[PDB]
């Protein structure tokens, strides 16, 4: 519940010297650190608690959503900016087989990507016509 135009004046009760102080004073708290600020929006001191953030088991800028009956992983709608986007991936793909080895879930997918295949030539029914895809 921090909106624009506000001004931060505390950090766990301690007055703050500058923004570059605060920038540092939290660049050193580990991810998920919980802190409580002091705030100024239009002449009112409001106290706000918080938790840091980072900057189905996905792989290399993607999103691996499982599918039913142990047939293979599935996802649509991959973000366009990833290195997993310039591979040729579109919205709406399935999983079935991996490196002449049948992959039927995320556990079978990692047991392919665990052995570090430089080839990564894996694909399934992508859309409505069977095709083959490659990476790395």
């Amino acid at each position: 519940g921090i909106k624009a135009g506000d001004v931060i004046t505390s950090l766990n009760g301690k007055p703050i010297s500058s923004f570059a102080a605060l920038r540092a004073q939290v660049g050193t708290m580990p991810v998920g650190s919980k802190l409580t600020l002091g705030l100024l929006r239009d002449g009112k001191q409001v106290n706000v608690n918080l938790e840091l953030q980072q900057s189905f088991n996905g792989i290399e800028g993607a999103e691996m959503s499982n599918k039913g009956k142990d047939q293979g992983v599935v996802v649509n709608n991959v973000k366009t900016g990833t290195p997993a986007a310039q591979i040729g991936l579109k919205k709406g793909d399935v999983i079935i087989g991996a490196n002449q080895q049948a992959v039927k879930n995320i556990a079978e997918l990692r047991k392919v990507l665990d052995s570090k295949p430089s080839v990564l030539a894996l694909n399934i029914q992508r859309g409505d016509s069977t095709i083959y895809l490659l990476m790395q």
């Binding site: 923004f19 920038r23 939290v26």
Partner: peptide, 5 residues
């Protein structure tokens, strides 16, 4: 410029 906290 603008530096994220």
């Amino acid at each position: 410029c603008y530096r994220k906290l």
